[PDB]
Amino acid sequence: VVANYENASMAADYIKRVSNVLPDIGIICGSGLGKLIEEIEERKVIPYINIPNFPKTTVAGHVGNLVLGSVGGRKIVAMQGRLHMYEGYSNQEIALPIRVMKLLGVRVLLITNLAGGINRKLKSGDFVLIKGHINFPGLGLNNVLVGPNQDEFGPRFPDLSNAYDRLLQQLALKIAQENDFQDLVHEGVYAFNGGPTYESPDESNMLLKLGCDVVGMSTVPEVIIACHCGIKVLAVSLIANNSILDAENDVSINHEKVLAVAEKRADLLQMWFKEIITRLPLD
Amino acid sequence: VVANYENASMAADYIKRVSNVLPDIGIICGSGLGKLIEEIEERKVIPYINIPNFPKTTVAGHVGNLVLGSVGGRKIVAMQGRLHMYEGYSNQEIALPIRVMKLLGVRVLLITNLAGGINRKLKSGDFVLIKGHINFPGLGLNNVLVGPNQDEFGPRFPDLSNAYDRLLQQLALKIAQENDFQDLVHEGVYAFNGGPTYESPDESNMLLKLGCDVVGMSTVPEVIIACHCGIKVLAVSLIANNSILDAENDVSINHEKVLAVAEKRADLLQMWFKEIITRLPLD
Amino acid sequence: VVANYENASMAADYIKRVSNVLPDIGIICGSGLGKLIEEIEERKVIPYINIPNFPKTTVAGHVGNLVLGSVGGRKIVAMQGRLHMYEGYSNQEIALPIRVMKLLGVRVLLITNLAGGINRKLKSGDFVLIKGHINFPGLGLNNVLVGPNQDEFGPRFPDLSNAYDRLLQQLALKIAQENDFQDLVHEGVYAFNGGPTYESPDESNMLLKLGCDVVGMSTVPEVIIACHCGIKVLAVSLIANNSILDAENDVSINHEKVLAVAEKRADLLQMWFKEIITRLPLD
Numbered sequence: 001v002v003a004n005y006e007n008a009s010m011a012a013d014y015i016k017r018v019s020n021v022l023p024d025i026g027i028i029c030g031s032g033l034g035k036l037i038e039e040i041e042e043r044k045v046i047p048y049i050n051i052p053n054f055p056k057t058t059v060a061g062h063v064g065n066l067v068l069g070s071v072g073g074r075k076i077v078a079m080q081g082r083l084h085m086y087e088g089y090s091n092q093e094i095a096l097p098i099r100v101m102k103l104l105g106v107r108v109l110l111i112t113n114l115a116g117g118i119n120r121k122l123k124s125g126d127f128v129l130i131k132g133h134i135n136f137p138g139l140g141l142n143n144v145l146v147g148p149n150q151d152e153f154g155p156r157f158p159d160l161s162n163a164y165d166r167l168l169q170q171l172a173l174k175i176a177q178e179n180d181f182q183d184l185v186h187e188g189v190y191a192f193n194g195g196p197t198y199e200s201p202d203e204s205n206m207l208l209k210l211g212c213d214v215v216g217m218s219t220v221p222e223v224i225i226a227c228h229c230g231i232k233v234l235a236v237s238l239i240a241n242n243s244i245l246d247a248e249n250d251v252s253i254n255h256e257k258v259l260a261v262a263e264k265r266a267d268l269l270q271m272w273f274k275e276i277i278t279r280l281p282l283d
Numbered sequence: 284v285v286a287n288y289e290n291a292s293m294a295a296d297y298i299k300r301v302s303n304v305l306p307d308i309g310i311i312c313g314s315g316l317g318k319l320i321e322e323i324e325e326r327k328v329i330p331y332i333n334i335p336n337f338p339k340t341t342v343a344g345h346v347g348n349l350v351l352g353s354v355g356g357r358k359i360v361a362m363q364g365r366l367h368m369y370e371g372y373s374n375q376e377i378a379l380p381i382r383v384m385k386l387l388g389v390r391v392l393l394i395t396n397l398a399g400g401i402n403r404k405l406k407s408g409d410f411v412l413i414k415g416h417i418n419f420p421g422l423g424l425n426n427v428l429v430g431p432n433q434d435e436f437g438p439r440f441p442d443l444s445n446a447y448d449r450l451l452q453q454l455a456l457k458i459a460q461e462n463d464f465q466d467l468v469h470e471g472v473y474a475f476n477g478g479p480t481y482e483s484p485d486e487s488n489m490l491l492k493l494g495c496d497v498v499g500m501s502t503v504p505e506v507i508i509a510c511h512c513g514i515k516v517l518a519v520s521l522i523a524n525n526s527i528l529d530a531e532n533d534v535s536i537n538h539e540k541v542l543a544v545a546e547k548r549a550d551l552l553q554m555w556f557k558e559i560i561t562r563l564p565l566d
Numbered sequence: 567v568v569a570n571y572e573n574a575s576m577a578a579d580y581i582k583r584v585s586n587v588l589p590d591i592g593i594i595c596g597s598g599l600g601k602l603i604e605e606i607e608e609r610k611v612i613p614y615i616n617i618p619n620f621p622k623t624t625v626a627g628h629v630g631n632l633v634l635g636s637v638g639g640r641k642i643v644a645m646q647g648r649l650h651m652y653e654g655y656s657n658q659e660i661a662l663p664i665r666v667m668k669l670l671g672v673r674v675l676l677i678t679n680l681a682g683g684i685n686r687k688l689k690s691g692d693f694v695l696i697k698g699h700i701n702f703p704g705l706g707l708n709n710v711l712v713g714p715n716q717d718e719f720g721p722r723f724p725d726l727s728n729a730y731d732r733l734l735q736q737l738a739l740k741i742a743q744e745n746d747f748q749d750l751v752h753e754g755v756y757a758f759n760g761g762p763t764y765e766s767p768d769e770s771n772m773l774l775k776l777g778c779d780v781v782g783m784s785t786v787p788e789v790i791i792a793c794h795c796g797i798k799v800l801a802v803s804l805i806a807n808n809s810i811l812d813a814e815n816d817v818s819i820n821h822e823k824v825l826a827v828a829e830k831r832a833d834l835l836q837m838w839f840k841e842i843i844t845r846l847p848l849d
């Protein structure tokens with residue numbers, strides 16, 4: 001199923017009938033960072049399998065829901081259960097939910113993820129406001145926009161110069177200052193590793209020479225689809241470990257340690273994004 | 284349809300019957316740089332959709348023709364309407380027209396494209412004679428030759444050390460000196476970004492560290508297929524903008540500005556390649 | 567055919583019935599480096615086409631056998647006829663034979679390959695014990711593990727920090743010292759170029775800046791599948807040429823010169839790995 005104007009409209013038609021919510025804000029949370037989706041007020045949970053033209057996620061399994069409701073007086077739509085390209089999903093399957101968000105009226109997309117630190121200033125438990133990215137799949141002919149262009153959503157050759165909104169980064173940093181955890185908040189360039197293997201010690205060493213501050217396996221496809229159709233983006237990475245430090249000390253990297261860091265920071269991140277949603281500018 | 288010896292021969296059989304032209308030179312022009320195809324003498328225009336085994340281009344749309352005729356006393360065949368890999372075409376679809384050119388008797392392939400400047404010495408409106416390339420799709424298992432090797436056309440492991448002919452670069456530079464626009468002609472290494480998104484500011488910064496002078500979204504697949512079967516190549520990039528300058532000044536990159544640069548330089552490039560064709564060495 | 571637990575078991579069932587050999591060691595040899603497969607004692611040769619669920623190799627042609635028997639008192643299984651990803655094989659086709667090796671009881675995998683030298687200390691005819699790798703296909707969303715994870719074999723996010731066993735590298739180096747050819751044995755980082763084109767002179771220059779010592783077109787997919795399911799790996803590259811030297815002197819790179827180097831070093835490499843197999847630690 002192509003993520004075109006007609007197929008995305010069929011999905012939005014179903015969502016509009018099931019919930020009265022017309023959201024202005026979209027949210028995609030990383031694994032273990034989705035507790036905020038539980039406190040959505042007046043919420044409607046729609047499984048992916050019930051939405052027309054939504055991608056099939058049975059092979060991977062686990063949760064896959066679209067949740068719509070209110071947070072701090074704001075109408076939002078949240079993706080519960082993230083689609084990652086290392087699972088084998090095509091460009092069309094990744095793009096359709098974001099373009100359905102666009103047809104529902106989403107103008108701001110807030111994204112969180114887990115990732116590894118490359119810049120020696122980044123430690124486990126730090127946050128990174130993403131101000132730019134280095135897209136290795138895109139350079140190697142695996143860009144999420146490879147294929148025919150859907151002209152109703154955006155241009156054939158998008159400009160990514162301002163994909164990460166400056167004013168949204170300033171707002172997130174100010175809220176961190178107001179609550180005195182600005183000592184955990186950095187800015188940096190995000191490198192897209194397709195995955196699913198963690199970067200080898202020598203791959204981390206290469207990313208250090210290339211100017212990468214953070215490396216992860218997601219986010220960049222969603223940001224490009226959102227920037228393509230004109231949706232503002234705020235992207236925040238939670239640093240689970242510094243792979244340059246781990247290479248020097250021969251310390252292993254595994255998913256159990258990563259999720260433990262997510263649990264250590266889940267509540268603080270939930271409070272942070274709840275206030276960001278509340279403080280998002282109006283018209 | 285595989286771009287094998289049998290399928291390419293079926294296409295060449297049709298072309299040979301429709302036109303008496305046996306071309307020695309092949310031409311592929313970038314968007315907005317194809318006015319020379321309008322001045323082909325005694326020309327025959329063959330739409331792609333009429334040629335057996337030629338790739339289907341209806342989804343992308345727009346012009347797609349094979350034009351055969353004479354330029355300056357030389358017999359040429361021109362591709363009007365370029366096939367780009369960011370559109371979703373497979374390796375086989377890209378390769379077949381060049382291998383059909385080979386079966387028609389083409390020995391020299393002349394290519395132009397639009398691209399962005401990385402080397403700080405490159406300005407908008409400059410020309411770059413490509414003397415080498417850095418193929419990011421090829422390194423990441425998306426090389427145009429990935430798949431079974433068609434032994435009738437070339438070897439399994441081609442050498443790209445001399446893919447860009449030295450004597451053809453010298454000839455193009457001499458013609459520029461004879462007409463006093465050598466101050467616009469540079470040499471450089473071409474980086475292949477799969478596209479279709481323009482390079483982010485940080486991706487341009489990485490390409491500067493990697494030694495890339497120019498970055499674009501085409502040409503390298505055609506050069507590899509041509510070098511595979513023994514066709515000499517001359518490749519010229521027209522610099523639409525310097526993305527390193529644009530990153531420092533936060534200036535946007537879009538296709539409208541790119542085509543305006545192509546229109547600014549179209550006539551000069553048409554005169555240039557008309558003389559290159561005329562001056563190409565004989566046997 | 568997916569390389570899952572059920573399909574690999576069907577292949578192992580057939581292999582177990584055809585040969586009484588329960589191997590503990592697996593071997594994959596590069597082109598021209600497989601003479602050791604001829605001296606397997608009490609050996610059984612099983613063509614790939616006869617094994618259920620084994621990938622189809624008729625399009626590429628040439629030899630494709632699984633050989634099981636004894637070397638120096640050790641029970642081994644050898645892949646005769648290597649599957650390379652530049653041929654067009656999918657992730658599932660590459661992975662299945664290694665996962666069948668795992669189900670047969672293989673705990674150590676020994677791999678050899680031909681490659682080009684980047685580090686200026688590497689000359690033609692040298693050996694390189696691979697201690698790490700830089701996987702460009704993996705970074706660009708062409709990792710061999712992209713797709714659904716087969717949980718019976720390994721985790722979703724594997725750690726590659728110790729994919730190349732330290733103790734196996736020490737053993738191979740000691741045997742080289744015992745026979746006085748340690749002056750040919752180096753250590754280095756292996757870069758994975760998808761192929762099938764040899765690296766351009768500028769691509770070799772980039773790999774020099776990125777810290778790559780060796781570049782080749784294989785091995786890394788097999789190492790990742792083996793590390794995924796817990797198989798120890800020893801990987802040795804034979805340097806056919808130094809492409810940085812060849813770029814400075816404009817010397818061509820072709821497969822005929824590469825195979826001549828393999829023939830020059832075949833017997834020494836056969837003696838080397840025969841002793842490595844004999845000296846592999848017991849329980």
Ligand code: HPA
Pocket residue numbers: 114115116117193198199215216217240241243253258
């Ligand atoms: O090192 C890592 N840690 C956590 N997440 C990651 N995603 C890519 N690399 C890493």
Ligand code: HPA
Pocket residue numbers: 397398399400476481482498499500523524526536541
């Ligand atoms: O910056 C650019 N400008 C014009 N063409 C391009 N192709 C890739 N990047 C660019």
Ligand code: HPA
Pocket residue numbers: 680681682683759764765781782783806807809819824
């Ligand atoms: O330069 C080379 N020589 C031999 N094998 C190779 N594999 C990749 N590059 C090379």
